[PDB]
């Protein structure tokens with residue numbers, strides 16, 4: 599499944615495909631852009647079956663409902679919802695277009711890379727553990743992006759040797775998605791990513 603969106607400030611693409619032979623996806627995402635801001639999130643539930651989905655879906659729902667809150671507030675609501683669930687790894691990104699500012703918070707192995715035309719990339723290491731409902735010490739990143747920046751948020755189903763290179767070379771989110779096609783054919787795990795290109 600691919601879904602694309604565009605406005606004056608960003609173009610996005612969401613790709614999601616299940617593990618080969620698996621009916622219920624354990625990954626979830628949420629994406630919403632208006633003329634002023636973007637909210638998005640990607641999550642990968644622990645365990646299997648309906649229980650992995652229950653966990654990542656709870657995140658999708660909370661990010662949509664609480665989108666106006668700061669990322670660390672949203673992720674903490676997500677953490678509380680994991681109590682008595684399998685838990686999930688997750689990443690939450692908010693962008694304010696007028697300021698060209700983004701904020702980011704994550705726990706676990708859902709990765710985020712933002713590539714600047716200047717050749718700088720924001721590429722945090724994964725934070726160990728997962729959202730389990732137990733106490734977290736969140737790390738929130740706040741920074742300015744330059745026009746022309748491109749980014750990806752992806753679950754562990756996408757395993758690419760040099761993701762930065764794909765972002766640098768691609769001229770649109772459709773091109774970057776096509777550039778990643780060889781990593782999507784095996785379907786060893788659920789695979790979810792969100793691409794963005796920022797004006």
Ligand SMILES: [Mg+2]
Pocket residue numbers: 642753754755787788
């Ligand atoms: Mg996974």
